Design a binder for this molecule. Structure first.
Ligand SMILES: *[C@@H]1O[C@H](CO)[C@@H](O[C@@H]2O[C@H](CO)[C@@H](O[C@@H]3O[C@H](CO)[C@@H](O)[C@H](O[C@H]4O[C@H](CO)[C@@H](O)[C@H](O)[C@@H]4O)[C@@H]3O[C@@H]3OC[C@@H](O)[C@H](O)[C@H]3O)[C@H](O)[C@H]2NC(C)=O)[C@H](O[C@H]2O[C@@H](C)[C@@H](O)[C@@H](O)[C@@H]2O)[C@H]1NC(C)=O
Ligand SMILES: *[C@@H]1O[C@H](CO)[C@@H](O[C@@H]2O[C@H](CO)[C@@H](O)[C@H](O)[C@H]2NC(C)=O)[C@H](O[C@@H]2O[C@@H](C)[C@@H](O)[C@@H](O)[C@@H]2O)[C@H]1NC(C)=O
Ligand SMILES: OC[C@H]1O[C@@H](O[C@H]2[C@H](O)[C@@H](O)[C@H](O)O[C@@H]2CO)[C@H](O)[C@@H](O)[C@H]1O
Ligand SMILES: OC[C@H]1O[C@@H](O[C@H]2[C@H](O)[C@@H](O)[C@H](O)O[C@@H]2CO)[C@H](O)[C@@H](O)[C@H]1O
Ligand SMILES: [Ca+2]
Ligand SMILES: [Ca+2]
Ligand SMILES: [Mn+2]
Ligand SMILES: [Mn+2]
Lengths: 238, 238
């Protein structure tokens, strides 16, 4: 059982994408996850997401088989303000179908608190720009989140302000290895992170896949969270 | 902490920190040509060359059972100038017993002696394979994770960007036992990833040598270049 999609760019109306919160697709084909003010500056106190309309079959209880998958997307985060510190980040997430945006700020529109809760049934790879109490001190950092905003693994990386980053996330069901890579063509910088994740005991049999972004809790604690392309592929062995 | 690291932004003829074996030479221009390049600028077949960092690396300690985490990065280019016969054989990053000499060439890439898996090899390698031997998947080129055998425990096909520079990142996390590798072609923006579980305690000796090896084919024109422009490495033993 296979499923996949590829957006080399986005266009206003694409029935295959559900926009939630402040998320909008510009005429230029850019998915702005968080609000961009009239004057071009990123707005604080903003949360937006996008979900692929079709659900994905990740695993099956009867057969006990698990799907391997991969997703890729390009994004740019620009932190224009001299102060205060920018926030909060963007993230790729997989979880229960028909989900609506959760809490913003450090929860990135995906979680509701900083608890360890198996009921979240969510897996996510974050690109975190603000260090919250539950975070490592280094920001930005990539993070692998399993049923909690408290990453089971993190990797610091240097932002190349306003430049486009290419992300590759892949999950191999056989080894249970979830890996993510971030590349900045502008500088050639490459960052990687990987950890074991048993999706069988984390995600529901069917899930929705999406992208979410959020700006800060105080004036000007913000940055852009723009996405230019997004592709996904999953194959469930029978 | 037991740490070791080196970084060659380019290579200099005479650098006492590198041991050149086989056909390997360092050009005045600072390029490490693993396999012989003829005076007419064309790569010679039946060529095998390697380079080893002169200092041994402490990967693990049997007394305490501690295992080091490490990472290596290098840039290389493989140019296949002939339309016939098929190009061969590839290049590889390998870690194994110190004071080793080039092994069999061709598809064994100067690191192994035959296709059998043998603990006596005590070698871990990440290959960039260009010719499909009987023990290989049909697709070439491909990245391969080699544990005591030229027959990879995991492979990932990738499209060559003929003659262009590829950036490689290989990292081992002792806590998760995850060995990952990434190849990026700035020229096209292509990104490839591969990862698998590897218990280095049961594979490598406490102290190892790290090196790069390249080899061309067993018949005329079954050749390609195996040039390396830079190489860095770092390991941390708790
Ligand atoms: C790929 O294949 C190569 C070549 O076969 C191999 O490298 C050779 O390994 C052999 C070991 O099997 C090396 O030979 C030894 O050399 C030392 C140093 O002089 C001697 O002390 C050894 O003799 C003792 O041990 C013998 C048992 O192995 C025993 O029979 C002797 O009586 C003595 O106690 C041994 O010398 C040989 O002894 C048998 C004689 O008939 C023979 O003429 C004599 O050579 C040999 O030098 C290596 N050759 C080269 C060029 O490297 C690769 O791996 C080996 O690499 C070695 C450097 C070392 O690290 C070995 O542990 C390793 O197995 C093979 N590649 C891999 C990694 O699999
Ligand atoms: C995250 O916060 C959400 C908002 O409160 C929770 O969803 C809400 O779940 C209620 C039932 O638990 C349901 O009545 C509400 O309609 C729904 N949304 C609203 C408007 O409140 C969410 O709850 C989780 O998901 C639901 C579907 C159930 O499975 C709950 O048991 C879950 O807790 C919150 N998620 C978590 C894990 O806290
Ligand atoms: O500053 C960005 C940062 O804000 C945190 O929330 C702060 C808030 O900004 C501050 O004015 C108030 O006094 O305390 C809050 C914390 O309790 C967010 O939590 C963080 O995610 C960022 O958005
Ligand atoms: O052709 C490149 C390819 O050669 C293989 O070796 C061949 C050899 O080329 C051929 O002339 C001979 O008859 O049989 C050999 C075994 O198939 C190498 O094994 C392979 O690695 C490449 O180098
Ligand atoms: Ca955070
Ligand atoms: Ca081969
Ligand atoms: Mn975080
Ligand atoms: Mn191979």
């Amino acid at each position: 059982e296979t499923i996949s999609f590829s957006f080399s760019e986005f266009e206003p109306g694409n029935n295959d994408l559900t926009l939630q919160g402040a998320a909008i697709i510009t005429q230029s084909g850019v998915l702005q996850l968080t609000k961009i003010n009239q004057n071009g500056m990123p707005a604080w106190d903003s949360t937006g997401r996008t979900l692929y309309t079709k659900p994905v079959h990740i695993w099956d209880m009867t057969t006990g088989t698990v799907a391997s998958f991969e997703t890729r997307f390009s994004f740019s985060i620009e932190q224009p303000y001299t102060r205060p510190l920018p926030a909060d980040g963007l993230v790729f997430f997989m979880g229960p179908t028909k989900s609506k945006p959760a809490q913003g700020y450090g929860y990135l529109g995906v979680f509701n608190n900083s608890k360890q809760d198996n009921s979240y049934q969510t897996l996510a790879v974050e690109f975190d720009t603000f260090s919250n109490p539950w975070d490592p001190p280094q920001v930005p950092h990539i993070g692998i989140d399993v049923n909690s905003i408290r990453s089971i693994k993190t990797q610091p990386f240097q932002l190349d302000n306003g430049q486009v980053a290419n992300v590759v996330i892949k999950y191999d069901a056989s080894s249970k290895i979830l890996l993510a890579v971030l590349v900045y063509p502008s500088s050639g910088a490459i960052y990687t992170i990987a950890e074991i994740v048993d999706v069988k005991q984390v995600l529901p049999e069917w899930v929705d896949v999406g992208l979410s972004g959020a700006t800060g809790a105080q004036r000007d604690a913000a940055e852009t969270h723009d996405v230019y392309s997004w592709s996904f592929h999953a194959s469930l062995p029978e």
